[PDB]
Amino acid sequence: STFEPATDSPLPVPGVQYFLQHVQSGKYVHPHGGSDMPGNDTALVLHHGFDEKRDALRWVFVNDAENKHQLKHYSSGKFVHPKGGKVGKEATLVVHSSPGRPETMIEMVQEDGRTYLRHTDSDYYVHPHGGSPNPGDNTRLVYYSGYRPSLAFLAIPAETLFVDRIEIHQAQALESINTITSLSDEHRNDTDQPVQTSISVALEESLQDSAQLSFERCFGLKVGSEFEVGLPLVGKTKVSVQFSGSWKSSTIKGEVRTSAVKVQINEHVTIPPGKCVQIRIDTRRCTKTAPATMYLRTASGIEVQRETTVTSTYHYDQEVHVVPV
Ligand SMILES: CC(=O)N[C@@H]1[C@@H](O)[C@@H](O)[C@@H](CO)O[C@@H]1O
Ligand SMILES: CC(=O)N[C@@H]1[C@@H](O)[C@@H](O)[C@@H](CO)O[C@@H]1O
Ligand SMILES: CC(=O)N[C@@H]1[C@@H](O)[C@@H](O)[C@@H](CO)O[C@@H]1O
Ligand SMILES: [Cl-]
């Protein structure tokens, strides 16, 4: 299915760079005038303009002991304040070189399946001035009571992270074992002497290993085209998995490069006269689900975290028997 920004918008991770997009208009959040160093009391506006290389369009959510629920302009380090210093009806959002306070708190929230910018501990949300679902370029953003779907924002990741590790939460780590039983053709010796007979089985489709990372909305982070992580696909022993997807994916597919079992079976069986045999392959499959924490690093080595669900199918043991028919 196609990425649907209204149902799939991720909640931003604090300390990571984001672009902010007004979903209904597709316009981005800019400082008015587009400077990398906006002046104090410069309004936040919506503008169709977009360039991934423009640091002036990057925003960072902050939530720490010194800055509780605040929003920072990346290129300037200025915070997003209500003009005049307290949230109220039609208070313009501005950048200002001063720390946030309780009466300036701003965060992205999920309400009825969409993400909005909200003044924490209030019913004031971020609206375009005039309330249009399709505001004109340079329309200022304001605080106003209540929300409606046309006010939704999408936080688009604006930097590339490294996936350092994924740690499974074993308290909810569930393994189901299933035997996959595969039979060759019947081979009969219709001669009057014992015959050594070549019997082959192809199991590629049956014994496909896989792993997936799943998210309720979407991964929401950029980590490059592929990344490798060790995952405990059966018991505690880590297996190398290569994942590839996009920040927009709700399921990131992983490849297991090293198979633990055989997918081509070639047996040489002595069949007595008049007798018929088959090769029987029994392959143990571990289907595993576990909540997990992804640990990612910024280029400067700041650690952030993302919850996921790890699902995997792994064929880990195999037996081959000659069975009579
Ligand atoms: C070319 C250029 O930087 N133009 C910018 C535009 O992209 C947008 O940021 C706007 C916000 O008020 O300020 C300027 O017009
Ligand atoms: C000291 C003080 O409260 N200053 C605030 C500043 O932090 C910011 O909120 C600004 C927005 O217009 O309003 C005032 O100047
Ligand atoms: C009825 C209506 O759409 N009213 C809107 C209001 O909800 C809010 O968006 C405001 C922001 O300036 O613009 C208009 O007044
Ligand atoms: Cl609406």
From TrEMBL:
Q: Mind telling me which InterPro entries this protein's record contains?
A: Ricin_B-like_lectins
Q: Where does N-acetyl-alpha-D-galactosamine 2 bind?
A: H81, G84, S98, R101
Instruction: Cite the SUPFAM superfamilies for this sequence.
Output: Aerolisin/ETX pore-forming domain, Ricin B-like lectins
* Residues annotated for N-acetyl-D-galactosamine binding in this entry: H81, P82, G84, E90, S98, R101, G130, R148
Which superkingdom does the taxonomy of this entry point to?
Eukaryota
Q: Where does N-acetyl-alpha-D-galactosamine 1 bind?
A: H30, G33, R54
- Specify which residues bind N-acetyl-alpha-D-galactosamine 3 according to the UniProt entry for this protein: H127, G130, R148
Spell out the protein name for this chain. Answer: Uncharacterized protein
